[PDB]
Design an enzyme around this catalytic site. Structure first.
Site, PDB file in Angstrom:
ATOM      1  N   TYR A 145     -21.824 -29.123  -8.493  1.00 33.38           N
ATOM      2  CA  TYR A 145     -22.765 -30.188 -10.207  1.00 33.38           C
ATOM      3  C   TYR A 145     -23.749 -29.069 -10.248  1.00 33.38           C
ATOM      4  CZ  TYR A 145     -21.812 -35.220  -9.818  1.00 33.38           C
ATOM      5  OH  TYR A 145     -22.210 -36.482  -9.912  1.00 33.38           O
ATOM      6  N   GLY A 148       0.241  -5.321   2.140  1.00 36.09           N
ATOM      7  CA  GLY A 148      -1.385  -6.037   0.905  1.00 36.09           C
ATOM      8  C   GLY A 148      -1.178  -6.126  -0.422  1.00 36.09           C
ATOM      9  N   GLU A 201       3.811  -5.039   7.540  1.00 35.73           N
ATOM     10  CA  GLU A 201       3.100  -4.570   8.846  1.00 35.73           C
ATOM     11  C   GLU A 201       2.908  -3.966  10.149  1.00 35.73           C
ATOM     12  OE1 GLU A 201       1.860  -6.628   6.211  1.00 35.73           O
ATOM     13  OE2 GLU A 201       0.079  -5.961   5.549  1.00 35.73           O
ATOM     14  N   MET A 225       0.410  -1.524  -0.046  1.00 30.03           N
ATOM     15  CA  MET A 225       0.321   0.252   0.349  1.00 30.03           C
ATOM     16  C   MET A 225       0.414   0.946  -0.307  1.00 30.03           C
ATOM     17  SD  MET A 225      -1.204   1.516   3.713  1.00 30.03           S
ATOM     18  CE  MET A 225      -2.551   2.424   3.108  1.00 30.03           C
ATOM     19  N   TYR A 229      -2.385   7.017   0.544  1.00 30.51           N
ATOM     20  CA  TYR A 229      -3.417   6.945   1.017  1.00 30.51           C
ATOM     21  C   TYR A 229      -3.864   7.862   1.996  1.00 30.51           C
ATOM     22  CZ  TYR A 229      -6.273   4.426   4.833  1.00 30.51           C
ATOM     23  OH  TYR A 229      -7.497   4.508   5.812  1.00 30.51           O
TER      24      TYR A 229
END
Ligand SMILES: CC(=O)SCCNC(=O)CCNC(=O)[C@H](O)C(C)(C)COP(=O)(O)OP(=O)(O)OC[C@H]1O[C@@H](n2cnc3c(N)ncnc32)[C@H](O)[C@@H]1OP(=O)(O)O
Ligand SMILES: CC(=O)SCCNC(=O)CCNC(=O)[C@H](O)C(C)(C)COP(=O)(O)OP(=O)(O)OC[C@H]1O[C@@H](n2cnc3c(N)ncnc32)[C@H](O)[C@@H]1OP(=O)(O)O
Ligand SMILES: CC(=O)SCCNC(=O)CCNC(=O)[C@H](O)C(C)(C)COP(=O)(O)OP(=O)(O)OC[C@H]1O[C@@H](n2cnc3c(N)ncnc32)[C@H](O)[C@@H]1OP(=O)(O)O
Ligand SMILES: CC(=O)SCCNC(=O)CCNC(=O)[C@H](O)C(C)(C)COP(=O)(O)OP(=O)(O)OC[C@H]1O[C@@H](n2cnc3c(N)ncnc32)[C@H](O)[C@@H]1OP(=O)(O)O
Ligand SMILES: CC(=O)SCCNC(=O)CCNC(=O)[C@H](O)C(C)(C)COP(=O)(O)OP(=O)(O)OC[C@H]1O[C@@H](n2cnc3c(N)ncnc32)[C@H](O)[C@@H]1OP(=O)(O)O
Ligand SMILES: COc1cc(C=O)ccc1O
EC number: 4.1.2.61
Lengths: 247, 251, 240, 245, 245, 247
Positions: free
Chosen positions: B234, B115, B138, B65, B70
């Protein structure tokens, strides 16, 4: 049991029931006939006290080459749509509905080719030993269908996420050493020693209280689906049920 | 030159989706997130593209990230802006990607942190360079793994090893990533492109709708019981037969 | 904590709390007494600023030889006895506030598998022996033992060891994924400490969010986890 | 928002964003245009501080007559498969992917016909008031399909087992009073009082802290999926997230 | 006898019925951490007491419980880790011990029931209330989502629309509405509350306690399991009951 | 003609409606291992019989079913081998819900009278249910000294609120047809003299639907309860498309 079924043979030796898929000329392909007979075999063997442990194996060079593309389709198209429902249920019935939580311990003895639909009973079987020389493949993709029945789940239960996707998506084959490495089977050994290893394992299982063994094997398969808090309840219940039933 | 932060190249049916912020080690900004949505949405409709290969420009795959980019947006807007910014990251990283219409391969050419693990595991298969370095940094930055990072590990890497790398934040190489199940294979960077392309070619040979049914069905069946799968798998098989216009012509 | 508990010892060194199962004479078999004290130990070390990381280990040759079979009454006492075992083994331990490491110095059997796997990380001695001996004694695995295997060890392997009751050493336990690594006994305490100190350098609230989130996310879909994991991250930021 | 969208109108009054499906000549059938506009509506109102509660309602006699038989089904079914999957995904995106866990409180205000696919956004909306005169129906069975998208789950979440199977399997219609009695909606009232009652509820909701309201409503819908023991963890996380935000 | 044994709680056993009386009537039986800890001890003690065959959870004075103690929680909390313990203690008696308690439990709701009181109310197997009892999930109006297992308690007993209404609005509701919604088994006039409760307790006392426990526990667990999972689970409970009885 | 075919059950088909009648009224239609084995046969048989469009499960005489047969199903099985118990339990589950809950054709329980204990599993396996006001229900298990066995407690959980279910399971108290309808256990209760007419009206409605489509719709609904919304997006669209194929 001799000559009882057209597509399966059962050989009970001293507590160990060898259930032999027996269409070697078709590489033990799983036709509707075979599905219906395997249902009768599993039901019959459940109630036969001389069968203490079941070993599922194949006659000839195959273990099973998967669904019988011809006979499955032959029967299905000869009937209305609702016939397909019955035919699919019969496959599920022996491959895992009966087999996955079977009353008795089960071992897959994979002597050769194992393709497509064979993965479901392979995994429903509690433990599994294969030949180094055996070859596996999820060839559905190369036939133009995604894995049907419980094949993809059989993979999900035993083989890592990445590996499972690789083999499902490519249809690429792998040998016995690879199958043990990926966790599809417990062990891969040279074919010459397959039967020896399998019998040793089957006799180790014969040493245990069958009802206790059943509680342990079933409880393990179920527990994977439950939380720790749910398992506290479930796993003690299986414990206590074992004590009641173990006679 | 359609996107600012991403390049796409299609050769013989293979769409190389190249994260393209090399100066920032391909960190994921809101711009990148928004543009990746458009990329995935665009390529989905492109009949020329049959397999997507998600890779990075320069040395990194993604360093994760973009934390400056951000905060740039999140602190200039009210709390509710954060909702949107998170939805956008998730939207391309896994909401579209994990069950993508088309087969996907992460070609991890280098740095893969934080991330980055979510789109990594969203991608169906993954080949990395031996020389690639991964890490769940992190923890050393003072946050638990964000978005779907921890689930991405859960899906692919054993319990003990997952906890180890989440808890310590230690880095590992491509060989050890292959080993732990995070990726399919690790090969020398010099062979990374050729190895990925041979895999990609294999996948282009398959019926698209059928491959889709197969790969989605696998990912979903992990969440279901055997008896739930009897029904679900199925259904995917029967759906695949209808949607494949195509043909399934083994038969 | 010297002398405080009959069957356990706690030894704290520079953030590392060694919790030492201490019935060497019975191979640290887990009795009702031990279970009750372990609950007390866990609750105490939780609120004690001096403990930053717990390492769970065993006095003498055993880590633990499992539930104590000798250590009868009215039916309802069994409820409490089972609950007390569960309470320390995993109800408190699996999602414990603080990082935990099992240091498996020797014998690990049966019911020992439950707190082994509740412990976040685990290092064992090459010389250690593990086994799911339940089956040989005529019961399936009790309490959380089977789920403990399900979380860490492959399907085939789990069933193999559970169905046969065959023992395995440290190296195999690491290879199966039961523990993080296996080292010679001689280097167990040092290797464990190095790992412990690494975790002591993390922000405890963040570490807690990270390790709790990971164990819980295994149970949830990706969609559920988008909600849950971001919630854990935000809860982390609040509790700082 | 005047003239912004072709098939939906947004009229905001006093913090209440009335979102009005606006194809009355087609009884508000949900076409691909409407589905794509609804996504934009939801995304826009999310970031618009003037909108504190969304009221989902329909122009004319209909709330919604379901998916557009012409534009959503017939015209699409024949076209490229890949476009079909995208069209389905866009229907889901507004009907429940954005709406069920919407950031802001939502109320369906069901003024008339509600069929088929309308049940998904109906149940995605947190609360719902309908008119006594509104008629509901899971008509899919009579059109030759099982209920599509999340319609069956919308029923499973709000209507008991026997009643859901009954209405799905027969496709029989039912009025607003029955809808409230089975749990499909919170309340049914005469159409003449529908707006008043709905506005009164919205005003109550607008008095709450938005973030705390979000945490409570999200938390409830998620907790139905989790065990008590998973919920101890999850719900405390939502409470702590709430305090942070 | 348990006379005078706990500060915030009373236990009075008559003919096998253990009345557990929340006893801070000056504070409307608000659940402080002292009360949480004492309740843990009460449940643990009554479990092993053969004189107690059924437990009835009621409140002294006008409240059943006014919910968590605002003052005494917010007090006892710094260092951060203390909140872990206090939250555990609350969960420990409210539902960790109580929801799957070895003996049958009945909530006897005599008055005010708010907020956090919903967790033990629903952990208790059955519940009778007075028509005069007032319930509310006031958490929203205090600026927190429902904490602990409150939203799950609602999710287990009250329909989706009704639960969201009460959670989102914080509106109060009386005993009759509580019964209509499914939150309790029955609402009766206050004057009849004790005897109705007792009549029910006497019925439960007549059952084989181990069997009753298998049955009540298996029901609550089975809600979480699929049919194929419950074939295994429920037979295991049956067989366990046959062993232990 | 199904006349004379089974010892303990009857099948009468009129205009696409297959009345499946539990037929030991002198034992109040108690469910013995004979009746369980026979009901397995009935359901497999009717599934493939195109004359049967909708199944109505009902009882001869005053009972719907008084539950499992205390003598033939419990007492005598207890005297037999442990492994026999396993098969007996499986055979009860097999018709009661394993075939019946996701049966290919629409099902309606027509509850003409007593419905106790074990009855509740096939009651709720049946898609829809109409009962008589005069019918009396009860989870009598607690008063015979067992918790509800097989799927009974899950049948209640799927259909009746948490409080009411515990109340009836814990107390063993009986309740009538109107209260059964009020609690959500059945769709509707009518006087007995009208039960047959009301049931046939419902069945006729059901027979107008495309069977394959009806099958997708009732199956998808039952299964969607177990899945989250995101899961159902996949699963329910798969059901819709599978339906368009097989239809
Ligand atoms: C849905 C699913 O299960 S997908 C999986 C389907 N199965 C497969 O993809 C495997 C198909 N088979 C093969 O690849 C090969 O037969 C192998 C590798 C198993 C064996 O190779 P060979 O030793 O060269 O034998 P060969 O291919 O000649 O087969 C022998 C006979 O078995 C038949 N057979 C083999 N597999 C199958 C099958 N799955 N279904 C029907 N018949 C089969 C062959 O058609 C051939 O028939 P014939 O000689 O009577 O005409
Ligand atoms: C529910 C569950 O946990 S499954 C049961 C799991 N545990 C087991 O199978 C272990 C049983 N014990 C053993 O196998 C062995 O004691 C070993 C391998 C651990 C060690 O054996 P040794 O080194 O030969 O020492 P030994 O067996 O003599 O142990 C000495 C003491 O430990 C006691 N002990 C060891 N484990 C246990 C136990 N689980 N319960 C009760 N007592 C135990 C022995 O009774 C013995 O007591 P004593 O000196 O008063 O006679
Ligand atoms: C999964 C799904 O969503 S399946 C479809 C489920 N929807 C339904 O069953 C509702 C179908 N519609 C109806 O039954 C009726 O139109 C009602 C009851 C809503 C209203 O009836 P009326 O007032 O008589 O209006 P009428 O039937 O004439 O429709 C008026 C206009 O709306 C159109 N319309 C109504 N419903 C729809 C629809 N679902 N899709 C497309 N157009 C619709 C009609 O075709 C007509 O338009 P046109 O004259 O330009 O062709
Ligand atoms: C996390 C949760 O559980 S959310 C909090 C839940 N509780 C609530 O929303 C309501 C709190 N209390 C009330 O609304 C009212 O007290 C009622 C309706 C219960 C009773 O009202 P009244 O009978 O008029 O009495 P009153 O409001 O004076 O309360 C009596 C005493 O109980 C105390 N009290 C009541 N509830 C609580 C509580 N939840 N925590 C702490 N103290 C409380 C009051 O502070 C008051 O104290 P005081 O006389 O020592 O100063
Ligand atoms: C897990 C389970 O399913 S446990 C079984 C739960 N079932 C029950 O609790 C119901 C038991 N049966 C009864 O209470 C009653 O028989 C009723 C109310 C159904 C009907 O009562 P009545 O009209 O008085 O008839 P009565 O009691 O005389 O029964 C008639 C015959 O049916 C037999 N019978 C009735 N129910 C059962 C049963 N569940 N199992 C075995 N036999 C039964 C009786 O033993 C009696 O047999 P007999 O004439 O051979 O001696
Ligand atoms: C359908 O089989 C059973 C039903 C019941 C009902 O209480 C109990 C035990 C059983 O085996």
């Amino acid at each position: 049991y001799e000559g009882r079924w057209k597509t399966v043979k059962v050989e009970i030796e001293d507590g160990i029931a060898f259930v032999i898929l027996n269409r070697p000329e078709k590489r033990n392909a799983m036709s509707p006939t075979l599905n219906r007979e395997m249902i009768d075999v599993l039901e019959t063997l459940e109630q036969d006290p001389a069968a203490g442990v079941l070993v599922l194996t194949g006659a000839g060079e195959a273990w099973t080459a998967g669904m019988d593309l011809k006979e499955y389709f032959r029967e299905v198209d000869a009937g209305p749509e609702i016939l397909q429902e019955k035919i699919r249920r019969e496959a599920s019935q022996w491959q895992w509905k009966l087999l996955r939580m079977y009353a008795k311990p089960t071992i897959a003895m994979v002597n050769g080719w194992c393709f497509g639909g064979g993965f479901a009973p392979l995994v429903a079987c509690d433990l599994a030993i294969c030949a180094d020389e055996a070859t596996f493949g999820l060839s559905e993709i190369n036939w133009g269908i995604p894995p049907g029945n419980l094949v993809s789940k059989a993979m999900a239960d035993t083989v890592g996420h990445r590996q499972s996707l690789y083999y499902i998506m490519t249809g690429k084959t792998f040998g016995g050493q690879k199958a043990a490495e990926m966790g599809l089977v417990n062990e891969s050994v040279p074919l010459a020693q397959l039967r020896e290893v399998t019998i040793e394992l089957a006799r180790n299982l014969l040493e245990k209280n069958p009802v206790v063994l059943r509680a342990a094997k079933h409880g393990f398969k179920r527990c994977r689906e439950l939380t720790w808090e749910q398992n506290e309840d479930y796993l003690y219940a299986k414990l206590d049920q074992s004590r009641l039933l173990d006679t």
